[PDB]
């Protein structure tokens, strides 16, 4: 079910979750006063929520969460991050550089407080309200002077909600020391790593296992040899119990950000601009990256990377897209603006429709300014690597004119240090050409020449159009063109030949009209921002924040739903829930992706599920549940209807990523590892049993 509901709206919403099927006691989950399951979720490494599930602090969270402190602790003997980690005492459990959990010890309400602090500022039209600055300076005088050093391990933040109607206070309890407990091999953790990606049904063991250790009092510490594991106030239960379809579910973590207030003018803005602008271009990107990749083994190790990593955000504006074009989000919007709209009229203040025009006004007044920002970004700042080669910093310039030779020494020096990170092993200057001029053809068709960044003035004015021909000479006179060609430079360099240079011209050409289009669109936000503040606080006092959430803002929520399937198209249904015999039918030795763990197969083949297989010996992986997550929501409990964990939210499916704007009841889902399955690969695959026996493990 909708909404990503603050802690205090547990009461305001307890009577739909108890109908959905919630039975534990409301201050039991949720208690401002005393202990409460809450106790036991962490924000981990600031991004991934977590979850302690033992009086040893022991910690879950997902692999993909875990991953780069399982591979700080991977050498080429021992890869942890191939074969997993199962540290079989305390003492083997590995500290980790710079790494937190964060309990949120105590969340009160200071609207009251923050709106009479508010009023003490002139300027009507101060963004204070919003500012993280002046809210810390609030939480700073609301907490004392050297509250930081009173309580040590605590401190305050003020966040803003509803577009500034509502202010909370957040203490939070920081821990430090946090060691490697276990992991599943990457052959589990990321079982259909990139094919499978914001897919159901799914089929990974994402989780990885961590320990908060303290000192002496359980006090937060950074890492000591005398460290000992935090006892905490509070751990989840793990139930045996599985899931059947249509059991209640819910989940309490950190989603980061959502747009549920969006007007119908910023649906349309978001679609033609932002989303149509990043499929185009990184469409052109994506087919010129394969093309190479195909043609050249070396191509596909270099550029592997850089293509999953273009492909994250393509995959989600076309799910983002299909979504306003298929499930009504621009009409849904629209018509929520109308009802305001309406009741403002009747309550006689035009307030409300005064705010959605600014914001119409203002989205439509900035749309060639974005779309030319977008064009820039896309097209150029992220499509074109040589866009981010060396410019020689004001100091650099000035330190090769410098009648002092030791400077310019050292200035070649780090020019040579920027030309090595920009010419790496993965770095192909043949490929770099290949997409700079696909790339540039599509931007020097949308981008008329009196809006073109000045270098790229020179296709029309010194080349004929000739796009190839601008890209060959970029590299052919650049003294980043080549390794010899910055060799030559450096042997005798003149600032008059990086003044001139074809391709530092382009680089900080290009970088003065992205600023340039991020300066002129700066002020456009304000408006907005005030107006949603209008906006939001009219939503509010006509229908209640019942049925009306606040958007996501990296702040703890819990969301609720039930453990169900969906159909995504024609006379296709995809079930609650996947079982091991996915895993095999997907196995592929020869796909990296899709190697299956031997100690698992052999688990599989002799059906050795002890106590974790559904009543029926089939063996759940994942579950999938109506329940309302965005990106924050990685390593989320799961609990049952009494608060047990039953699994660790991990993924959502691409149909719903238009959830953040509009919640899909019939499409959107969260991706979740089955709780039995983290057991099963814990017990049969790593043989961790002193983890299984800490743990509270119920029928
Ligand atoms: N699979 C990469 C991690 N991304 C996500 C993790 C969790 C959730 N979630 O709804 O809880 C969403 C995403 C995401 O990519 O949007």
């Not at 939001?536 to 703890?556: R, S, V, W």
């Amino acid at each position: 079910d909708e909404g990503m509901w603050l802690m205090q709206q547990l009461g305001r919403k307890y009577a739909q979750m108890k109908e959905r099927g919630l039975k534990m006691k409301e201050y039991d989950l949720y208690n401002p006063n005393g202990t409460s399951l809450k106790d036991a979720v962490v924000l981990f490494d600031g991004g991934c929520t977590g979850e302690v599930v033992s009086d040893r602090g022991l910690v879950l969270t997902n692999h993909h969460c875990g991953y780069d402190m399982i591979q700080a602790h991977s050498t080429l003997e021992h890869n942890y991050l191939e074969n997993g980690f199962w540290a079989m005492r305390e003492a083997d459990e590995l500290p980790n550089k710079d790494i937190s959990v964060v309990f949120i010890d105590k969340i009160e309400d200071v609207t009251d407080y923050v709106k009479k602090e508010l009023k003490a500022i002139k300027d009507p039209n101060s963004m204070d309200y919003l500012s993280p600055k002046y809210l810390q300076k609030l939480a700073d005088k609301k907490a004392g002077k050297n509250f930081s050093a009173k309580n040590p391990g605590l401190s305050v933040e003020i966040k803003a909600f509803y577009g500034g109607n509502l202010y909370l206070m957040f203490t939070k309890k920081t821990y430090t020391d946090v060691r490697l407990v276990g992991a599943p091999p990457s052959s589990i953790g990321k079982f259909g790593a990139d094919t499978d990606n914001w897919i159901w049904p799914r089929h990974t063991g994402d989780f990885s296992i961590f320990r908060i250790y303290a000192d002496k009092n359980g006090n937060p510490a950074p890492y000591s040899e005398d460290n000992v594991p935090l006892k905490p106030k509070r751990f989840f239960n793990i139930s045996l119990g599985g899931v059947q379809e249509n059991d209640y579910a819910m989940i309490m973590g950190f989603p980061g950000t959502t747009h549920r207030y969006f007007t119908a003018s910023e649906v349309d803005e978001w679609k033609s601009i932002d989303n149509d602008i990043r499929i185009r271009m990184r469409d052109i990107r994506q087919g010129v990256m394969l093309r190479e990749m195909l043609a050249d083994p070396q191509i596909k190790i270099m550029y592997s990377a850089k293509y999953a990593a273009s492909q994250n955000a393509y995959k989600r504006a076309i799910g983002a897209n299909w979504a306003i074009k298929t499930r009504g989000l621009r009409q849904n919007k629209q018509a929520m603006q109308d009802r305001l709209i309406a009741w403002g009229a009747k309550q006689g203040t035009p307030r409300y429709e005064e705010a959605v025009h600014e914001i119409d006004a203002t989205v439509a007044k900035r749309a060639d300014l974005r779309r030319r920002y977008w064009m820039i970004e896309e097209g150029i700042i992220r499509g074109i690597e040589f866009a981010r080669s060396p410019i020689p910093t004001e100091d650099e310039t000035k330190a090769l004119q410098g009648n002092d030779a030791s400077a310019r020494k050292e200035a070649i020096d780090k020019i040579r240090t920027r030309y090595s990170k920009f010419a790496n092993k993965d770095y192909s200057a043949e490929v770099d050409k290949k997409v700079a001029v696909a790339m540039l053809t599509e931007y020097l068709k949308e981008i008329p020449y009196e809006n073109l960044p000045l270098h790229l003035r020179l296709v029309k004015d010194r080349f004929a159009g000739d796009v190839q021909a601008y890209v060959d000479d970029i590299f052919a006179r650049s003294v980043f063109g080549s390794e010899a060609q910055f060799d030559a430079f450096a042997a005798v360099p003149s600032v008059e030949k990086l003044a001139e240079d074809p391709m530092v011209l382009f680089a900080s050409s290009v970088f003065d009209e992205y600023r340039k289009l991020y300066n002129e669109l700066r002020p456009y936000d304000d408006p907005i921002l005030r107006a949603q503040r209008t906006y939001i606080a009219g939503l509010l006092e006509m229908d209640g924040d019942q049925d009306q959430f606040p958007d996501a803002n990296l702040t703890l929520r819990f969301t609720y739903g039930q453990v169900k399937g969906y159909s995504p198209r024609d006379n296709v249904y995809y079930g609650h829930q996947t079982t091991l015999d996915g895993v095999m039918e997907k196995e592929d030795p020869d796909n990296w992706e899709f190697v299956v763990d031997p100690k698992l197969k052999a688990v599989y083949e002799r059906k050795d599920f002890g106590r974790y297989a559904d009543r029926s010996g089939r063996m759940p992986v994942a579950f999938c549940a109506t329940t309302h997550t965005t990106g924050g929501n990685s390593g989320s409990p799961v609990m049952n209807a009494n608060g047990e964990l039953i699994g660790l939210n991990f993924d959502r499916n691409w149909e719903g990523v238009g959830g953040d704007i509009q919640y899909l009841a019939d499409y959107q889902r969260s991706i979740i590892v089955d709780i039995r399955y983290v057991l099963l690969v814990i017990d049969k695959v790593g043989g961790c049993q002193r983890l299984l026996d800490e743990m509270n493990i119920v029928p």
